[PDB]
């Protein structure tokens, strides 16, 4: 409650010594209340690089590029995907940097943000999303998205790294992570990626708003936002009193999403991001209480293993369906104890 009361997006600058232990740093940023915003930025030490050069990836295959068709008006939009045939990074880059798809000329972000919400339904861009793989070198032990060594490893999908090749106007709709997990996003290179976040304590208010605007979608599926098709502009969130914050992620910076932190955003132009999910001991309760997509046959993790290992006291009580536990969104992870 006292740590980060404003629930604003916090930016962190760890030293090389702070940065070497990933799981410890997550506990540290939570003791600082970063989780309250639902999104945090981590700028790594200048000496740190996950790869020496991004020169040898032209022939990397993007198995399923998606053309994003957006329909909507007055801040409310639905994004439909059209899967295209496999393309390489070289071909994707040519299309991203071409006169048809390149970033418009602008001065400040506010102008580019305006151009985004004004033009998101025109000239459908291509998103080189959900590419199985990593751009990290094998010797990189610090913050390796391919091997974070968190408690989520107990599961083995959701623990594997994904690549996202963006172009101007490519977007990610309002959503929380699968099983309401944490996510790590590293911007390898290229143009920025802008982000919007709703604090987890206000997450239910966003759902409430989304249900009112898409009632057909709300009846068919209780967790329709997990379809990742719903785009709601910041001006629409302001109109209906939803608290949110924005941040721009530049190349070489990490973004951390927290359990039940709703986020959306867009790519400024040609770029590449690496993403995976992870957990801490705080996530277990969110996983047990997560409202999952019913209509699609989706990412569902059996919580038994986590409850039997970290909550043995509550395991039989939870298996009977008696655990009436109410999640406190403001509370940091138990691992943060050393920083308090
Ligand atoms: C499983 N797969 C994960 C799907 C999944 C979850 N979050 N998420 C995203 N979260 C944050 C950022 C991005 C982004 O920049 N682009 C695209 N997607 C993003 C994408 C399926
Ligand atoms: Zn996400
Ligand atoms: Zn569904």
Residue written as token pair 């996003």: 185
Answer yes or no: are the C-beta atoms of 30 and 39 closer than 8 Å.
no
Number of domains in the chain: 1
**Ligand 1, atom 4: nearest CA belongs to which residue?**
130
**2 part of a folded domain:** no
Q: Experimental method used, please?
A: X-ray
**Ligand 1, atom 12: nearest CA belongs to which residue?**
172
Q: Which positions are annotated as active-site residues?
A: 157, 164, 175, 177, 263, 275
| CA 296 – CA 21 distance, rounded (Å) | 37
**191 part of a folded domain:** yes
| Resolution of the experimental structure, in angstroms | 2.1
**Ligand 1, atom 15: nearest CA belongs to which residue?**
172
**308 part of a folded domain:** yes
Residue written as token pair 């700028």: 43
Instruction: Print the domain residue range for 183.
Output: 9-340
DSSP-assigned letter for residue 104: P
Is the CB of 185 inside a 6 Å radius of any atom of ligand 1? yes
| CA 291 – CA 156 distance, rounded (Å) | 22
**197 part of a folded domain:** yes
**4 part of a folded domain:** no
Question: Which helix (H) or strand (E) covers residue 272, if one does?
Answer: strand 271-278
Tell me the best of 66, 125, 126, 172 to mutate to test the pocket of ligand 1, counting ligand atoms within 8 Å of each CB and taking the most: 172
**CATH number of the domain that residue 235 is part of:** 2.60.120.650
| CA 60 – CA 58 distance, rounded (Å) | 6
The tokens for 268 are 């400024």
| CA 68 – CA 151 distance, rounded (Å) | 34
Is the CB of 311 inside a 6 Å radius of any atom of ligand 1? no
Helix residue ranges, H only, the chain: 16-19, 22-31, 89-96, 109-119, 203-213, 215-220, 234-239, 283-289, 304-310, 312-319
**262 part of a folded domain:** yes
**1 part of a folded domain:** no
DSSP letters along 171-237, please? EEEEE--GGG-EEEEEEEEES-EEEEEE-GGGHHHHHHHHHHH-HHHHHH-TTGGGGS-EEE-HHHH
**3 part of a folded domain:** no
């Amino acid at each position: 409650e006292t740590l980060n009361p404003s629930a604003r997006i916090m930016t962190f600058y760890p030293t090389m010594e702070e940065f070497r232990n990933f799981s410890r740093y997550i506990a540290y940023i939570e003791s600082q209340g970063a989780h309250r915003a639902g999104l945090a930025k981590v700028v790594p030490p200048k000496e740190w690089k996950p790869r020496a050069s991004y020169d040898d990836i032209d022939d990397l295959v993007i198995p399923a590029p998606i053309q994003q068709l957006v329909t909507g008006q007055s801040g409310l939009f639905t994004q439909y995907n059209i899967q295209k045939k496999a393309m390489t990074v070289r071909e994707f880059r040519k299309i991203a940097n071409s006169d048809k798809y390149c970033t418009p000329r602008y001065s400040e972000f506010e102008e580019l943000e305006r151009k985004y919400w004004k033009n998101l339904t025109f000239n459908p861009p291509i998103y080189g999303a959900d590419v199985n793989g990593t751009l990290y070198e094998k010797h990189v032990d610090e913050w390796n998205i391919g091997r974070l060594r968190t408690i989520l490893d107990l599961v083995e999908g959701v623990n594997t790294p994904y690549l996202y090749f963006g172009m101007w106007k490519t977007s990610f709709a309002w959503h929380t992570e699968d099983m309401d997990l944490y996510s790590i996003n590293y911007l390898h290179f290229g143009e920025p990626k802008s982000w919007y976040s709703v604090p987890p304590e206000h997450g239910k208010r966003l759902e409430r708003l989304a249900k009112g605007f898409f009632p057909g979608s709300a009846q068919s599926c209780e967790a329709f936002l997990r379809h990742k098709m719903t785009l709601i502009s910041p001006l629409m969130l302001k109109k209906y009193g939803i608290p949110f914050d924005k941040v721009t992620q530049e190349a070489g910076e990490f973004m951390i999403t927290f359990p039940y932190g709703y986020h959306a955003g867009f790519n400024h132009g040609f770029n590449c991001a690496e993403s995976t999910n992870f957990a801490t001991r705080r996530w277990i309760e969110y996983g047990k209480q997560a409202v999952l997509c019913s209509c699609r046959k989706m990412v569902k993790i059996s919580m038994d293993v986590f409850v039997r290992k970290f909550q043995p006291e509550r395991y039989k009580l939870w298996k009977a369906g008696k655990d009436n536990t109410v999640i406190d969104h403001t509370l940091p992870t138990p691992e943060a104890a050393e920083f308090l």
